[PDB]
Amino acid sequence: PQLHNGLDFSAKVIQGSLDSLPQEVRKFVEGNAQLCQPEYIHICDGSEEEYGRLLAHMQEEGVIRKLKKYDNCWLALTDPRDVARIESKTVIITQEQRDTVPIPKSGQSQLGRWMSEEDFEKAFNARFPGCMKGRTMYVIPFSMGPLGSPLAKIGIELTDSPYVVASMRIMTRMGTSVLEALGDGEFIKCLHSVGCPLPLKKPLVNNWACNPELTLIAHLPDRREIISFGSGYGGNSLLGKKCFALRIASRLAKEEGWLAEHMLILGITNPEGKKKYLAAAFPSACGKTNLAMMNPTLPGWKVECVGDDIAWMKFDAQGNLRAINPENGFFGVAPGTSVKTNPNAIKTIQKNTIFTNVAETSDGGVYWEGIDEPLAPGVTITSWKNKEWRPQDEEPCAHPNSRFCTPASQCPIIDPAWESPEGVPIEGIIFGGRRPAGVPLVYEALSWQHGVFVGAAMRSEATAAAEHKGKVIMHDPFAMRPFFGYNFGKYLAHWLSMAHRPAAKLPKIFHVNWFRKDKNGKFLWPGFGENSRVLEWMFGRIEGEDSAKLTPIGYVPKEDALNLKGLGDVNVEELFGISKEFWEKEVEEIDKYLEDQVNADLPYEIERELRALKQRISQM
Ligand SMILES: Nc1nc2c(ncn2[C@@H]2O[C@H](COP(=O)(O)OP(=O)(O)OP(=O)(O)O)[C@@H](O)[C@H]2O)c(=O)[nH]1
Ligand SMILES: O=C([O-])C(=O)[O-]
Ligand SMILES: [Mn+2]
Ligand SMILES: [Mn+2]
Ligand SMILES: [Mn+2]
């Protein structure tokens, strides 16, 4: 026992029992309770009753609003400083810097942010002591991956935000049954605070508790800890998602021989009754959710959704690359979603869905740019800034990175194997990003090694998912730049090593560009459901169809190999144009980037593919 009261927080528990927790779980809750000083401790059970109480609570505190037009949907509006990921405040702590990022040749590293353990100690101690005064500490037991599955990973998140609790119930498998599966086994330790101890020294904007000045999202892979302070936005506060299932998991995957990637998983069935699964890595806000849920325009084709954002993959005993989606919902970008672009999303989000930073209509619905739906007379709009909004201002009505948070089981095309603990077999991997110039609609890699180099070479216009402005063209290898848990050079060698596995059925690798623009500045390709025409070509190439032509950058479809019927007006010359001037500059920029940023940790096979590409272009 103790010598006084001291450390027994039993009297403060308003739901559950510290005694019913596994020993290591109890030490985790109580040690941080003593540090953060919450007024109450709520051990989540994941039940419908509890969700209703949390929602009712948040509605009484002005944190969310009911959207009366839909069935159990809610709107939350944030402080405008707390709207996206902050890559410059996201850090990984290792003893040696080289374990986290390659030591660059000349400049600062863009492949992660390393912080020493001693420096993190000073930052932690300046933030967390007493940070939950007057608040409830919620204890969230959650599973990444199907519950009870051997490949699932379990975490415990402590947080003082009911908004985080509600969203974690949608995005993970959460509650009492997870604790029963965990037993006395290992768990990922997740600690979150909005960083606003009561009484408030500073008044809150839109009732949204956050601390932008002190915001810090830290990862400690050696201790299996994620520590996040000051932000409520989902990417920073839903610690099972980016922090756990990409950053921590990518290091675990390196150590254990699997992969954790920023990829969708879809199944596509053709008119002949054959179905294949594909994975695709596009950077944030570059089309993964719209592809994973696509409504194909080609008759006889069907797409089903396994996951839209995170894939965990491993070769099985038979040599098949098998993937699971570790998430339980979709946390998708709202603006641009409409009946014409993503009708399957529209059907999904009309019930049991939490919206953040979209507009509200006066009849209790939602609005955002590109929704493409007229309102009835008399209906008015309130912007995400909680202001009257007319369609002839300059501010958009919904934040560019506003999101819906919706259960995956509600998607009309959710794949029947999406909770299969054995995973689905991946037969192709797709890379791509926002390239307005030079990069053709689709090409295929020449080999496994060339395909890894294609992922390493990815570049893309910046988006609103993070703090980057200007629409400039940035490097984003494998769509994982903000998400590497460890040295990117070692990550490349891990990928390349997969071709050494016995009986490994390596998937085909493709690169796409939906975003090429003409001299006018409008897209050459209609995209969305029409991307089915590109997937058809990939499907045939996986079956071995002689439908490709060899080019300096890879294989591209032969003339008339793509079904272009019904479009007709598509400029095929510009969509597949390979300019030598463009690609000479492209290889130079890739060379400079890899040489500076990966330096001594660049695998030889990647350097060899760079040299070979440079030679093929020079012979044009
Ligand atoms: N022109 C064009 N735009 C697209 C296409 N697909 C998606 N978009 C737009 O790109 C934006 C981002 O699309 P998403 O599918 O949400 O992006 P994501 O890859 O899932 O992004 P994260 O969830 O942040 O990882 C949306 O507003 C879409 O409307 C396309 O095929 N063509
Ligand atoms: O939130 C996301 O999924 C992102 O930023 O990629
Ligand atoms: Mn993402
Ligand atoms: Mn998405
Ligand atoms: Mn090799």
**CA gap 222, 477 in Å, rounded:** 25
The per-residue DSSP string of 29-84 comes to HHHHHHHH--SEEEE----HHHHHHHHHHHHHTTSEEE-TTSBS-EEE---TTSSS
Enumerate the H helices of 174-331 as residue ranges: 176-182, 234-237, 249-256, 288-292
**CA gap 172, 155 in Å, rounded:** 10
The per-residue DSSP string of 74-143 comes to EEE---TTSSS--GGGEEEE-SSGGGTS---SSS--SS--EE-HHHHHHHHHHHSTTTTTTSEEEEEEEE
**CA gap 482, 95 in Å, rounded:** 20
Geometric angle at alpha carbon 353, from 350 and 354, rounded to 5°: 135
The encoded tokens of residue 372 equal 């493409």
**DSSP 8-class letter at 421:** T
Ligand nearest to the CA of 291: 1
Query: Do residues 357 and 80 touch, judged by C-beta distance below 8 A?
Result: no
Cα of 356 from ligand 2 centre, angstroms: 14
Q: Is 262 annotated as a binding residue?
A: yes
Whether residues 139 and 269 share a domain: the answer is no
Query: Do residues 439 and 505 touch, judged by C-beta distance below 8 A?
Result: no
**CA gap 192, 199 in Å, rounded:** 19
State whether the beta carbon of 309 lies less than 6 angstroms from ligand 2: yes
State whether the beta carbon of 523 lies less than 6 angstroms from ligand 1: yes
Assess if residue 3 is contained within a domain. no
The encoded tokens of residue 618 equal 């020079």
Q: How was this structure determined?
A: X-ray
Residue 609 CB-density burial (10 A; 0-12 exposed, 13-18 middle, 19+ buried): buried
Is the backbone peptide bond immediately before 102 cis, with ω within 30 degrees of 0? no
Assess if residue 30 is contained within a domain. yes
The amino acid occupying position 104 is: P
Q: How far is CA 70 from CA 53, 54, 166, 354, in A?
A: 19, 19, 18, 11
State whether the beta carbon of 531 lies less than 6 angstroms from ligand 1: yes
Mutate to test the pocket of ligand 1, among 284, 289, 404 (most ligand atoms within 8 A of CB): 289
**In 3D, which of 10, 43, 32 has the Cα closest to residue 227?**
32
Rounded to the nearest 5°, which phi and psi values hold at 34?
Answer: -60, -35
**In 3D, which of 434, 431, 438 has the Cα closest to residue 452?**
431
Mutate to test the pocket of ligand 2, among 238, 261, 309, 357 (most ligand atoms within 8 A of CB): 309
Ligand nearest to the CA of 466: 2
State whether the beta carbon of 482 lies less than 6 angstroms from ligand 2: no
Q: Is 549 annotated as a binding residue?
A: no
**CA gap 261, 242 in Å, rounded:** 10
Rounded to the nearest 5°, which phi and psi values hold at 405?
Answer: -130, 110
Cα of 286 from ligand 1 centre, angstroms: 4
**CA gap 363, 415 in Å, rounded:** 34
Assess if residue 1 is contained within a domain. no
Mark residue 399 as left, alpha or beta (left: phi above 0; alpha: psi -120 to 50; beta: remaining).
Answer: beta
**CA gap 196, 482 in Å, rounded:** 27
State whether the beta carbon of 246 lies less than 6 angstroms from ligand 2: no
Q: Which long-range contacts (CB under 8 A, 24 or more apart) does 116-122 make?
A: 117/93, 120/91, 120/93, 120/218, 120/220
Report the C-alpha dihedral over residues 503, 504, 507, 509, rounded to 10 degrees: -120
CA 590 to chain centre: 25
Q: Is 26 annotated as a binding residue?
A: no
The encoded tokens of residue 354 equal 């939490």
State whether the beta carbon of 336 lies less than 6 angstroms from ligand 1: yes
- Picking from 412, 431, 463, the residue at the C-terminal end of a domain is 412
Report the C-alpha dihedral over residues 452, 456, 459, 462, rounded to 10 degrees: 120
Assess if residue 605 is contained within a domain. yes
Give the CATH number, domain containing residue 16.
Answer: 3.40.449.10
Give the bridge partners for 267, in sequence order: 277, 304
Whether residues 138 and 176 share a domain: the answer is yes
Residue 321's Cβ-side half-sphere holds a number of Cα atoms within 13 Å equal to 24
Query: Do residues 158 and 32 touch, judged by C-beta distance below 8 A?
Result: yes
Query: Do residues 449 and 339 touch, judged by C-beta distance below 8 A?
Result: no
The per-residue DSSP string of 521-535 comes to SSBSS--GGGGHHHH
Whether residues 608 and 592 share a domain: the answer is yes
Query: Do residues 250 and 256 touch, judged by C-beta distance below 8 A?
Result: no
Q: Is 76 annotated as a binding residue?
A: no
The 3-state DSSP class for residue 551 equals: strand
Q: Is 148 annotated as a binding residue?
A: no
How many structural domains is the chain composed of? 3
CA 467 to chain centre: 15
Query: Do residues 279 and 478 touch, judged by C-beta distance below 8 A?
Result: no
The encoded tokens of residue 328 equal 């339980």
Whether residues 310 and 363 share a domain: the answer is no
State whether the beta carbon of 235 lies less than 6 angstroms from ligand 2: yes
Mutate to test the pocket of ligand 2, among 331, 401, 402 (most ligand atoms within 8 A of CB): 331
CA 72 to chain centre: 25
Cα of 90 from ligand 2 centre, angstroms: 14
Assess if residue 587 is contained within a domain. yes
Which residues have C-beta within 8 Å of that of residue 411, sequence separation ≥ 6?
293, 305, 330, 344, 347, 348
The encoded tokens of residue 481 equal 């730049």
**In 3D, which of 526, 489, 519 has the Cα closest to residue 605?**
489
The number of the ligand 2 atom at minimal distance from the alpha carbon of 283 is 6
**CA gap 385, 545 in Å, rounded:** 53
- Closest residue by Cα to atom 32, ligand 1, is 527
Give the bridge partners for 304, in sequence order: 267
DSSP E strand boundaries for 172-310: 173-174, 188-193, 216-220, 225-229, 259-261, 264-269, 275-281, 302-307
Name the residue with tokens 């037993």: 183
Whether residues 363 and 219 share a domain: the answer is no
Q: Is 288 annotated as a binding residue?
A: yes
The encoded tokens of residue 496 equal 């390349």
Residue 453 CB-density burial (10 A; 0-12 exposed, 13-18 middle, 19+ buried): buried
- Closest residue by Cα to atom 17, ligand 1, is 285
Whether residues 209 and 338 share a domain: the answer is no
State whether the beta carbon of 284 lies less than 6 angstroms from ligand 2: yes
Catalytic residue, candidates 286, 305, 397, 405: 286
Whether residues 289 and 204 share a domain: the answer is no
**DSSP 8-class letter at 16:** S
Cα of 558 from ligand 3 centre, angstroms: 33
Mutate to test the pocket of ligand 1, among 286, 305, 340, 478 (most ligand atoms within 8 A of CB): 286
**CA gap 99, 171 in Å, rounded:** 30
The encoded tokens of residue 500 equal 């050494």
- Closest residue by Cα to atom 2, ligand 1, is 527
Which residues have C-beta within 8 Å of that of residue 458, sequence separation ≥ 6?
281, 283, 431, 432, 433, 475, 476, 477, 478, 479, 511
End-to-end CA distance of the chain: 79
Mapped to the 3 state alphabet, what secondary structure does 606-617 carry? HHHHHHHHHHHH
Count other C-beta atoms under 10 Å from residue 143's C-beta.
24
Q: Is 309 annotated as a binding residue?
A: yes
Give the CATH number, domain containing residue 285.
Answer: 3.90.228.20
Give the CATH number, domain containing residue 391.
Answer: 2.170.8.10
Name the residue with tokens 């290889």: 587
Query: Do residues 125 and 505 touch, judged by C-beta distance below 8 A?
Result: no
Q: How far is CA 339 from CA 292, 370, 399, in A?
A: 15, 10, 20
Cα of 486 from ligand 4 centre, angstroms: 23
Q: Is 173 annotated as a binding residue?
A: no
Assess if residue 135 is contained within a domain. yes
The encoded tokens of residue 620 equal 């044009």
Which residues have C-beta within 8 Å of that of residue 618, sequence separation ≥ 6?
584
| H or E stretch covering 575 | helix 572-575
Whether residues 31 and 151 share a domain: the answer is yes
The number of the ligand 1 atom at minimal distance from the alpha carbon of 262 is 25
**CA gap 618, 620 in Å, rounded:** 6
State whether the beta carbon of 414 lies less than 6 angstroms from ligand 1: no
Query: Do residues 491 and 255 touch, judged by C-beta distance below 8 A?
Result: no
Assess if residue 4 is contained within a domain. no
Cα of 9 from ligand 3 centre, angstroms: 38
Rounded to the nearest 5°, which phi and psi values hold at 338?
Answer: -150, 175
CA 350 to chain centre: 22
**CA gap 253, 314 in Å, rounded:** 9
**CA gap 403, 304 in Å, rounded:** 22
- Closest residue by Cα to atom 4, ligand 2, is 284
Enumerate the H helices of 418-484 as residue ranges: 448-456
Query: Do residues 338 and 285 touch, judged by C-beta distance below 8 A?
Result: no
Query: Do residues 549 and 469 touch, judged by C-beta distance below 8 A?
Result: no
Cα of 452 from ligand 5 centre, angstroms: 11
**In 3D, which of 248, 213, 216 has the Cα closest to residue 94?**
248
Rounded to the nearest 5°, which phi and psi values hold at 23?
Answer: -50, -50
Whether residues 464 and 571 share a domain: the answer is yes
Number of separate helices (H) and strands (E) present in the chain: 15, 32
**In 3D, which of 334, 265, 331 has the Cα closest to residue 303?**
265
- Picking from 412, 434, 456, the residue at the C-terminal end of a domain is 412
> Near ion ligand 3, which residues have CB within 5 Å?
284, 309
State whether the beta carbon of 288 lies less than 6 angstroms from ligand 2: no
For the sheet with 64-66, list strands across it. 64-66, 74-76, 354-356, 403-407, 329-333
Cα of 261 from ligand 3 centre, angstroms: 10
Count other C-beta atoms under 10 Å from residue 459's C-beta.
18
Assess if residue 280 is contained within a domain. yes
**CA gap 486, 490 in Å, rounded:** 8
The 3-state DSSP class for residue 162 equals: helix
The 3-state DSSP class for residue 444 equals: strand
The per-residue DSSP string of 249-260 comes to HHHHHHHHT-EE
Which residues have C-beta within 8 Å of that of residue 122, sequence separation ≥ 6?
none
- Closest residue by Cα to atom 21, ligand 1, is 285
The 3-state DSSP class for residue 222 equals: helix
Which is it for the CA torsion 612, 616, 618, 619, positive or negative? positive
Whether residues 77 and 93 share a domain: the answer is no
**CA gap 360, 367 in Å, rounded:** 6
Geometric angle at alpha carbon 415, from 155 and 417, rounded to 5°: 65
Residue 342 CB-density burial (10 A; 0-12 exposed, 13-18 middle, 19+ buried): buried
Q: Residue 193: which domain range?
A: 9-62+86-257
- Closest residue by Cα to atom 1, ligand 2, is 235
State whether the beta carbon of 541 lies less than 6 angstroms from ligand 2: no
**CA gap 331, 352 in Å, rounded:** 13
Report the C-alpha dihedral over residues 612, 614, 615, 619, rounded to 10 degrees: 140
Whether residues 93 and 81 share a domain: the answer is no
State whether the beta carbon of 465 lies less than 6 angstroms from ligand 2: yes
- Closest residue by Cα to atom 6, ligand 2, is 284
State whether the beta carbon of 477 lies less than 6 angstroms from ligand 2: no
Task: Give the gyration radius of the chain's Cα atoms.
Answer: 24
Rounded to the nearest 5°, which phi and psi values hold at 54?
Answer: -60, -45
Query: Do residues 136 and 38 touch, judged by C-beta distance below 8 A?
Result: yes
The amino acid occupying position 465 is: A
**In 3D, which of 145, 170, 163, 153 has the Cα closest to residue 226?**
153
**In 3D, which of 397, 400, 403 has the Cα closest to residue 373?**
397
CA 421 to chain centre: 21
Q: How far is CA 1 from CA 5, 6, 23, 125, in A?
A: 9, 9, 15, 27
**CA gap 89, 113 in Å, rounded:** 8
Rounded to the nearest 5°, which phi and psi values hold at 399?
Answer: -60, 140
Query: Do residues 310 and 245 touch, judged by C-beta distance below 8 A?
Result: yes
Query: Is 286 annotated as catalytic?
Result: yes
Whether residues 374 and 469 share a domain: the answer is no
